[PDB]
Amino acid sequence: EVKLLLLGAGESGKSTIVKQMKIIHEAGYSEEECKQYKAVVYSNTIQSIIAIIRAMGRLKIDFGDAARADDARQLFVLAGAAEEGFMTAELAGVIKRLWKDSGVQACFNRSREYQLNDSAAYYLNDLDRIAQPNYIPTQQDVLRTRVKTTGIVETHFTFKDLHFKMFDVGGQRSERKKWIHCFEGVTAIIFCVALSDYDLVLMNRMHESMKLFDSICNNKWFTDTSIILFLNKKDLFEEKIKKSPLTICYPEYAGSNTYEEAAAYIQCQFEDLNKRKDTKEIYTHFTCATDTKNVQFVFDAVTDVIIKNN
Amino acid sequence: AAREVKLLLLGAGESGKSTIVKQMKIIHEAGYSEEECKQYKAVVYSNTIQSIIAIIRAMGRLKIDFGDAARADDARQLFVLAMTAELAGVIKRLWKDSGVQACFNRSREYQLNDSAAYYLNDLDRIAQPNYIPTQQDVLRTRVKTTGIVETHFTFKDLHFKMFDVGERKKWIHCFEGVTAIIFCVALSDYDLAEDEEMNRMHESMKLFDSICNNKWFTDTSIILFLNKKDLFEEKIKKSPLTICYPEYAGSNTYEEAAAYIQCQFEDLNKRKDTKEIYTHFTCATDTKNVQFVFDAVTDVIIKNNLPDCGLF
Ligand SMILES: Nc1nc2c(ncn2[C@@H]2O[C@H](COP(=O)(O)OP(=O)(O)O)[C@@H](O)[C@H]2O)c(=O)[nH]1
Ligand SMILES: Nc1nc2c(ncn2[C@@H]2O[C@H](COP(=O)(O)OP(=O)(O)O)[C@@H](O)[C@H]2O)c(=O)[nH]1
Numbered sequence: 167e168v169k170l171l172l173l174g175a176g177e178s179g180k181s182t183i184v185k186q187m188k189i190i191h192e193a194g195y196s197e198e199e200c201k202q203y204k205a206v207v208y209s210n211t212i213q214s215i216i217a218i219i220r221a222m223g224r225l226k227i228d229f230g231d232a233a234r235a236d237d238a239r240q241l242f243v244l245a246g247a248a249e250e251g252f253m254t255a256e257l258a259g260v261i262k263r264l265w266k267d268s269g270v271q272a273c274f275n276r277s278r279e280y281q282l283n284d285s286a287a288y289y290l291n292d293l294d295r296i297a298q299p300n301y302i303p304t305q306q307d308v309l310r311t312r313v314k315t316t317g318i319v320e321t322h323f324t325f326k327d328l329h330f331k332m333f334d335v336g337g338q339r340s341e342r343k344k345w346i347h348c349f350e351g352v353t354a355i356i357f358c359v360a361l362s363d364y365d366l367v368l369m370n371r372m373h374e375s376m377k378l379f380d381s382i383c384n385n386k387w388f389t390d391t392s393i394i395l396f397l398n399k400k401d402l403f404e405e406k407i408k409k410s411p412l413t414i415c416y417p418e419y420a421g422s423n424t425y426e427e428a429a430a431y432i433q434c435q436f437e438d439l440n441k442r443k444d445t446k447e448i449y450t451h452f453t454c455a456t457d458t459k460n461v462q463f464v465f466d467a468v469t470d471v472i473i474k475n476n
Numbered sequence: 477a478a479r480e481v482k483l484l485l486l487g488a489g490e491s492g493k494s495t496i497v498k499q500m501k502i503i504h505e506a507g508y509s510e511e512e513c514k515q516y517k518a519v520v521y522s523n524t525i526q527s528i529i530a531i532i533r534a535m536g537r538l539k540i541d542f543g544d545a546a547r548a549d550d551a552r553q554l555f556v557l558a559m560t561a562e563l564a565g566v567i568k569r570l571w572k573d574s575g576v577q578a579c580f581n582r583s584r585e586y587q588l589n590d591s592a593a594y595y596l597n598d599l600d601r602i603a604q605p606n607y608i609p610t611q612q613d614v615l616r617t618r619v620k621t622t623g624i625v626e627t628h629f630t631f632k633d634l635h636f637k638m639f640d641v642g643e644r645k646k647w648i649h650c651f652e653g654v655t656a657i658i659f660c661v662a663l664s665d666y667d668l669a670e671d672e673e674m675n676r677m678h679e680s681m682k683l684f685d686s687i688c689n690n691k692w693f694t695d696t697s698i699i700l701f702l703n704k705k706d707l708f709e710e711k712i713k714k715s716p717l718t719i720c721y722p723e724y725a726g727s728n729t730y731e732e733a734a735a736y737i738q739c740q741f742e743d744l745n746k747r748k749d750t751k752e753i754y755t756h757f758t759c760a761t762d763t764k765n766v767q768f769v770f771d772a773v774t775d776v777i778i779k780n781n782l783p784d785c786g787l788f
Binding site: 198202204205250251252316317318319320333336337340341344345347348 | 509510511512515518622623624625626627628639642646647650651652
């Protein structure tokens, strides 16, 4: 029986990794279980479009089809009386026309300049499928779900004759930091880093993640804890690096803005934080948390290592 | 912030901690929507199944026979069949058998969910192919808590953070600035964990003794919830408190037994001069009572554990 502790800044993907464990080892999501997330998908979806639109204002930008001005105001009024767990084709229509707007899509691409759900685009596009009244959220839909984790979530599953007891720690900064403390001496830690946070001006979000990793990695609490590093959201990174310069996050970066090199660099910047390199090793994997195939492959490796290290 | 309140739910398990949690959602936020409830259809069924199963499976250990020998058939199916309107049938019939009912009445002899009768006596409306469980049905569900559950709610201009730990031991101390502890006690447990050392009540007492006197919570208000008083109100009429406190010489009446049990718990406070215990007789499943109780709880927190910040 092993105790794995998902760690890392919010939105790095701890939760998504939990679901993948469910989907990959125990059973997954019954058409029944999925139905549960209908309200979350709607919530996320509406949240995504509102954010983008409410951003057009600040970033000073006009809608494509001048008429979308009506749908904009409509969006809000309909978001208020929204009966969670169900979305009206009326609202479904408002979002749809807005998402297909020239100026709105322009704001969407200027996404880094504000806060926007990673899943924003994924849901919005599939809006036709999701707007249906009988719509049953797919496993991917569930995986793309974004819900702030509170308290500590604990999942169980057996893999390779091993009883895994995983832990995702939500809660505020301090008590979280304090909960981590009562987690000193865990079999393993899977620290997640959202690679796509390099170009975000949230200190830098990436450096923040780094600072956090530095603490966990060189912390006396985990001197016998397999520090596993998930350089996650590699997909969003790839689509992003070809437009945004890694320099934004690392001015001391001489390489080129290409997935391979930049990714490699980020991995370097994190691994370099490890002080006791001769004593303890960092097991890294570039991941796409939402990608089940990727995560199974990756978790396979994590297990193997876990097995040896003990 | 001064208007931040950290609440920790403690107690023995099946003592009503999560029921309080569920209640905080129903009272201070929205409650369980038609959809959300539908989510619990399964647990309500499993709860129901393991309950009737627990009864039958116990008839044996207690040398009990079915009323009408015809049920022995349904007994067989129940197992080799585990909801279908067929299952609903084997249940209803078994739930009516005199012998079963008699086994159900000796529940203290074995382990049985407290919502057993509730569900079973409502099996019809429940087994309905178009069953949408009620908040109450949700409230009566039983499902082990894992990890740490957290609930946020604003009430009386206070921002509450309530925690329920899933077993729970060194994690209770893993909290900082805990404003208050709501310790739950299952009153109806007096006449019955594992018949190992002491009975549930004494277990709970050990638990409370440990917490009530812990110096880590010296600045934490100790709220005691003598819970499941509704179930307690019934058992005291047909089961002596002596089963739990052999030295008990009082009458087996709600009022007297309840007071006694309160005393046994409050006596444990080894710091009567400095630390006060705020006791409440509750029915975690009763939304009305919970809010009433919780309203009193906050006034206590406001009036005893908060800086002069404006609420009092
Ligand atoms: N595109 C993409 N999205 C991801 C990936 N991992 C997580 N997400 C999404 O990013 C958001 C945050 O994920 P979550 O697990 O909640 O992060 P957490 O707060 O660290 O637990 C959710 O919408 C996830 O579905 C990924 O690798 N690629
Ligand atoms: N009738 C009745 N049932 C209760 C009461 N409190 C809790 N229950 C039930 O007792 C069972 C266990 O409660 P739960 O909150 O899970 O206890 P926990 O293990 O301390 O969290 C559930 O079926 C609850 O619905 C009560 O006050 N009256």
